Amino acid sequence: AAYKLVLIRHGESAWNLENRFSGWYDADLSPAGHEEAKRGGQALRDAGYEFDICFTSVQKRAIRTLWTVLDAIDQMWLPVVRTWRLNERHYGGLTGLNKAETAAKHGEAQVKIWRRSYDVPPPPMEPDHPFYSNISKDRRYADLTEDQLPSCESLKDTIARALPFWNEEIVPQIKEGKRVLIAAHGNSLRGIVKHLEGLSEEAIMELNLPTGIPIVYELDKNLKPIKPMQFLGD
Amino acid sequence: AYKLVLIRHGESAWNLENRFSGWYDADLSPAGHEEAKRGGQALRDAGYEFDICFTSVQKRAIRTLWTVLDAIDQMWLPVVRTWRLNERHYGGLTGLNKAETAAKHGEAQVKIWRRSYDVPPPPMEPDHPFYSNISKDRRYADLTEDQLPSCESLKDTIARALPFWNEEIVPQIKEGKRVLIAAHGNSLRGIVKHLEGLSEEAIMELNLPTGIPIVYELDKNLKPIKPMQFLGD
Numbered sequence A: 001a002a003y004k005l006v007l008i009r010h011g012e013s014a015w016n017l018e019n020r021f022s023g024w025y026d027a028d029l030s031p032a033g034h035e036e037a038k039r040g041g042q043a044l045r046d047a048g049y050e051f052d053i054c055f056t057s058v059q060k061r062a063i064r065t066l067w068t069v070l071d072a073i074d075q076m077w078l079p080v081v082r083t084w085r086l087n088e089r090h091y092g093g094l095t096g097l098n099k100a101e102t103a104a105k106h107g108e109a110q111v112k113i114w115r116r117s118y119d120v121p122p123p124p125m126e127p128d129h130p131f132y133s134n135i136s137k138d139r140r141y142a143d144l145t146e147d148q149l150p151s152c153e154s155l156k157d158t159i160a161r162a163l164p165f166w167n168e169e170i171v172p173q174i175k176e177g178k179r180v181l182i183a184a185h186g187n188s189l190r191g192i193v194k195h196l197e198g199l200s201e202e203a204i205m206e207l208n209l210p211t212g213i214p215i216v217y218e219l220d221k222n223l224k225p226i227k228p229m230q231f232l233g234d
Numbered sequence B: 001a002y003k004l005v006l007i008r009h010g011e012s013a014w015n016l017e018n019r020f021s022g023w024y025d026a027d028l029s030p031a032g033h034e035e036a037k038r039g040g041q042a043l044r045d046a047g048y049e050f051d052i053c054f055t056s057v058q059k060r061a062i063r064t065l066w067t068v069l070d071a072i073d074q075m076w077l078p079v080v081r082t083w084r085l086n087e088r089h090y091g092g093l094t095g096l097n098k099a100e101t102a103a104k105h106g107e108a109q110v111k112i113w114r115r116s117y118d119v120p121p122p123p124m125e126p127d128h129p130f131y132s133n134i135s136k137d138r139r140y141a142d143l144t145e146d147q148l149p150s151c152e153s154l155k156d157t158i159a160r161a162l163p164f165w166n167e168e169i170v171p172q173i174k175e176g177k178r179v180l181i182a183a184h185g186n187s188l189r190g191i192v193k194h195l196e197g198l199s200e201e202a203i204m205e206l207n208l209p210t211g212i213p214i215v216y217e218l219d220k221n222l223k224p225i226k227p228m229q230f231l232g233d
């Protein structure tokens, strides 16, 4: 086809292992997550993939995944663009809580409702939240407007601030013929996949992208996929 | 009072820094990596923050930058890569050690190359082991015929580094962005020469230390207000 696009979700984070809601908390890769990013890199290398430009979030689990991939494929020299707009979903008050704490405080019913809903957000991260200053006052978000910096996000909110970056900064590069690598997060990548395949809310909430595995799209000139997404590996 | 930080990468693999590594894309050795880590830790201990980073398209400089950013928890910063901050291109000498260089070209000529500001080494010819590896590397595919060097004098290196400094780095500094530059001995020599208004002789005598943060305090005209400062112990 005309174009080729590659996506990868960051490998396992240290809070993926603790089973805690990271969201905008900047958790690093776990050692296993680093190995995942490395195997994804080796997969892209064995298949001879070349890129011209890379996009990622401002979160180090995604960034380190990109670094590990670029290292594996000997393309550390590529231009890299970072944006908060490819960040993980902001999980508001749930940030920092594990499964048990979440259920204990909100109940199994409320947790299932949040879990299965597309447009209902978790509660907001309030100023007394233990990660409030760590996230909301981080200087990497200093240039965001009052409206842009979320206290919480539904999957809808997430996709809503992710697709403008896709349309305005990524799409033109692709149509310029640049071969794009996007290393990011499950939910921000869900936005892109939903747009690409024209999926429904139910369908996208059913899609679970695996950590650290390359996802290949073959696109026509209008960025319509000519076939289903493909995973790279062994 | 603007604040500018430079860092020169450390040791590369296979003893390549003593083999005119030049435009060959040698990786850091584990020791060179550790140097970058100590420099990063130095910057962390001193509480330095940056807003933007510049580096070359060579992985020993890029991995130096990555290591520093990891160490100071600023992996999220915007990063700009440019061939214009590459190490000096050593042409036909690239990859040779001292004895091989003297044996192939003679002591007289080697001394002349070594002490001259504007005499380049011979070009890297098609039979050189790195000829296609460098000249055909796709990261330089957009360079024009004049821009892609077969060899460089120190004058040439500085001449292609300073327009990047002027056009891309200077505006950032003047907007108050705190700049980090991770690059190579000779490209950084170019910047230091421009900053301190040094002569050809002085800049050929200047040897910037590796893996140590180098701090400049500049006034509004980007003239240094004091000597360069090193961070560590």
Ligand SMILES: Cc1ccc(S(=O)(=O)Nc2cc3c(c(O)c2O)C(=O)c2ccccc2C3=O)cc1
Pocket: A019, A020, A021, A022, A097, A098, A099, A100, A102, A111, A114, A115, A116, A122
């Ligand atoms: C940190 C964490 C706590 C609980 C779980 S779970 O065992 O219930 N599995 C799980 C849970 C959720 C989710 C999930 O995908 C899941 O596998 C969600 O997507 C989700 C979205 C918005 C609010 C809450 C959730 C949610 O709790 C997983 C991860």
Ligand SMILES: [Cl-]
Pocket: A080, B079
């Ligand atoms: Cl980078």
